[PDB]
Design a protein around this ligand. Structure first.
Ligand SMILES: *[C@H]1O[C@H](CO)[C@@H](O[C@@H]2O[C@H](CO)[C@@H](O)[C@H](O)[C@H]2NC(C)=O)[C@H](O)[C@H]1NC(C)=O
Ligand SMILES: [Zn+2]
Ligand SMILES: [Zn+2]
Ligand SMILES: [Zn+2]
Length: 227
């Protein structure tokens, strides 16, 4: 997250981090069900761990912490390179979460975001671009949803309704390391960090996020088919 601020503690209980030994965080994820996470399809990995209810980046022990193992990874069937449409994937935890003020799922909105909607995106990604610089703790940033028209103009021929743009204010954007992370609007999960221009936070170049309102039926049917 470029130009964000340390998140308040306990305000992102659905935020997750994906790690692959020792504790190298490669993507964020979002707890959307007592036993399911949602992350970007390009964040797929065979072996990895899931960390929930943990504020800092380093593996410093925290009381609210809860570690898990991903038993099943299911990317949306429409995901493809280099278009990157349908950039979402379901991950099943080995066991259900112990609900607490630290670890709590969030609902996925079925109503699509309209131009002007203020949303909050969080992550442990780099706070600088192109120079890499990781934060100490979870970063938060409010971004506003642009119109699908402007979105398409900014990235001609590389955008469809499976995504949406957000982040008008310059110097502020999501970046590498935030991928798979949540974009919350109106108390609901509206999107996942997917991609954007590079370097991050270039003026008039908004971040592109997975448009989750288009996948509620698939998400719920997939979870039920594996319960
Ligand atoms: C983005 O905007 C939201 C909403 O304006 C900010 O949330 C506000 O936070 C302050 C300080 O905690 C509260 O006094 C307000 O009540 C909150 N808004 C409301 C009315 O819900 C949020 O902090 C902003 N995100 C960041 C970190 O910039
Ligand atoms: Zn706590
Ligand atoms: Zn690709
Ligand atoms: Zn530092």
């Amino acid at each position: 997250i470029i130009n964000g601020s340390d998140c308040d503690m306990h305000t992102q209980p659905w935020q997750a981090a994906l790690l692959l030994r020792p504790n190298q965080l490669y993507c964020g994820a979002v707890l959307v069900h007592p036993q399911w996470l949602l992350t970007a399809a390009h964040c797929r990995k065979k072996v990895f761990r899931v960390r929930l209810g943990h504020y800092s980046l380093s593996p410093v022990y925290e009381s609210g912490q809860q570690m898990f193992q991903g038993v099943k990874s299911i990317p949306h069937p429409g995901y493809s390179h280099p278009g990157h449409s349908n950039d979402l994937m379901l991950i099943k935890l080995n066991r259900r979460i112990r609900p607490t003020k630290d670890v709590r799922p969030i609902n996925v909105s079925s109503h699509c975001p309209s131009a002007g909607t203020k949303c909050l995106v969080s992550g442990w990604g780099t706070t600088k671009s192109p120079q890499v610089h990781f934060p100490k703790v979870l970063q938060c940033l409010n971004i506003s949803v642009l119109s699908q028209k402007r979105c398409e103009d900014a990235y001609p021929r590389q955008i469809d309704d499976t995504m949406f743009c957000a982040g008008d204010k310059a110097g502020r954007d999501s970046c590498q390391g935030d991928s798979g992370g949540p974009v919350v609007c109106n108390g609901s999960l509206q999107g996942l960090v997917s991609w954007g221009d590079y370097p991050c936070a270039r003026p008039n170049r908004p971040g592109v996020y997975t448009n989750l309102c288009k996948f509620t039926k698939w998400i719920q049917e997939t979870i039920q088919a594996n319960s």
